[model samples]
Target: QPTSFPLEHNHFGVMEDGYIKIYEYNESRNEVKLKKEYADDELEL
Candidate 1:
């Protein structure tokens, strides 16, 4: 229960600075990645 891509955990997200920031484990920085909110709501893909 700790992974999403490139091997990670602590998955989550946020909306700030007008960007859809994507979150995952092993992140070295904040808001490093972003994507559509659809993927966030549909966390099965």
Candidate 2:
């Protein structure tokens, strides 16, 4: 579910090597998860 949350964390996204990376944080597990990675070509406005 898009509205899901397990105390959703300080997740973030950034561009790197012409790719967009979205990382998810889990405070409970104290770990980061790679939520998504899209190439520049995939991010069309």
Candidate 3:
């Protein structure tokens, strides 16, 4: 899936048959730090 976060920021993922995921990010000092926490489920628009 091709997704955008916080409106303008973009991200991508390839989903398998049965899996779910979660994510958190920290943006300090003009750099992006992404943390992916794979769980049973999650969502974003």
| Candidate number that wins on lDDT, 1 or 2 | 2
Q: What are the TM-scores, per candidate, against the unseen true structure?
A: 0.30, 0.66, 0.27
lDDT tens readout by residue for model 1, 1-45: 223333236566665443345656444654444433543454445
Error of 1 at 1 (Å): 30
Candidate 3 lDDT, tens digit per residue, 1-45? Answer: 433334224333324433343333334444444445443344452
- Over 9-43, each residue of candidate 2 has an lDDT whose tens digit, in order, gives 57777667777777887778889888888887877
lDDT value, residue 35 of candidate 2: 86
Report the lDDT of model 1 for residue 19: 39
Q: What TM-score does model 2 achieve against the real structure?
A: 0.66
Candidates 1 and 3, the one with greater lDDT: 1
Candidate 1 local Cα displacement, residue 40, angstroms:
13
The predictions' CA RMSDs to the true structure, in order, are 8.9, 8.2, 6.5
Lowest summed lDDT across 10 adjacent residues in model 1 is found at 1-10
